[PDB]
Each structure stands twice: as structure tokens, then as C-alpha cells.
Amino acid sequence: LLGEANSFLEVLEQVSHLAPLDKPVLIIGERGTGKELIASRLHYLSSRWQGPFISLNCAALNENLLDSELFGHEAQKRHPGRFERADGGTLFLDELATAPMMVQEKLLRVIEYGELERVGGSQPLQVNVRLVCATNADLPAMVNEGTFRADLLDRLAFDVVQLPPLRERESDIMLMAEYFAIQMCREIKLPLFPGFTERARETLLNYRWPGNIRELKNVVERSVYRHGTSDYPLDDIIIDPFKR
């Protein structure tokens, strides 16, 4: 993983201590800051490392589909949900704050009882899953508004990993930019990355990176491609490809 910023190193140290626990971990961070990567690090550093790592984006599914994707539904005889698929392993729920209140209630019940309720006939399913969740919402604010369950937060938020946005990671922007530029040079067969000019560095370090590391990679790849030479340093950082 790339980065030297104290804020980021401190996250890695925190994760090394949290991973062996069976307790739920809440990751607060912006898109592209490595939420899923950290969730997967928690899994692979934990005693569950040989078990499944399953992900789901709560924001991507309507309420009824989220409900059946997480908790499963009947009808060859059953469509297992993500809790069942994660049994013995880890389930990463991204965009937690978008889960509808009915889902939040059902999530609290699974955490506190350790089983998934079942329609008549079939008995409840036991599940044994280590949960990691993420969002950039202000969850305490949502609790005040009535849009996030306080009880659920008392279960999910055993501890909180705060992932710093790229704009708050010291000089990690240039370290990562260089790394990404070099890999794009290999992809388009340039013999050497010719460096970034001061203008390019100013552009990179002054931009907010709303898309963080995902956005940085894309911008840098496009910029290297457009430059297309090892003869002269890269000067033009193409943040916005919709202008020109």
C-alpha cells in the first residue's frame, strides 16, 4: 500500500490491532480513500482470513432488493443473502448510512441474536460473520434527525477507523501520482517516466481530489497518455476531460 503520511500510518497500526477481534469496525471516509481495501485488510489480518470476504454497497439497491440481498429470501429452494455467504468470514457493508430504517432494524437483530429469521416452516439460520461497515455521513447527526438508529450504532461502532482524504495526507499525493504515472508508462511502453514539472505538481497538490485515490489514478493515467513522451517532463495535468 502506498503512503507515508502519519495519519495513514496510524490507520494501518490501528487496523493491525483491530483485525484479530471479532468486533464490528466502522470506517469513516470519503469515496476512493481505501475503505474496501482496509475492510479487506481487517479480514486478511484476522483469524477469519481463510473464510470469505463479501462486499455490498447499500446505496446501490432499492429497499426490497437490499433486504433480500442481505438477509436472503425463499425460492432453487433458497436465495442465500450476503450474511449467509459470509459465514465464517467477513461482510463489508459500504454506504451504511443509506440503509433504510427497516434494514437497520433487521441488521441490529442479526447482530444481537446471531440468526436470520425465516418464513414459516423453516427454522432460523445461524450466522457467524465479522462485520465491517463504511460511510462518510455524519452518523451522530443522523441519529439526531431520526434517520439512523442509535441502537444500531451502539452495536456497529465498537471502534472507528477514520481514513483521511488524499488532500489531508501530506505528500502522499506525489508519491502515489509518481507510482501511477510509472505504471502507465509501462502500459504505453514509455522507457522512463520523465517527471512532473512544478506547474504539474502545483496542479496535483492544490486540487481537492473529491474522488481521492480512484480519481488520482485516472487523472494521472490520462495525463501520461496525453503527454505521450519520455523526452520532456509532464506539465499538463488533465483533471477535467470534458473541457478538452
Ligand SMILES: Nc1ncnc2c1ncn2[C@@H]1O[C@H](COP(=O)(O)OP(=O)(O)O)[C@@H](O)[C@H]1O
Ligand atoms: N494506500 C493505498 N495505496 C495504493 N492504492 C490504494 C491505497 N488506498 C486505496 N487505493 C486504491 O484506490 C482505489 C480505491 O480504493 P477502494 O478501497 O476500493 O475504494 P473505496 O474507498 O471507494 O472503498 C483502489 O484501486 C485501491 O487499490
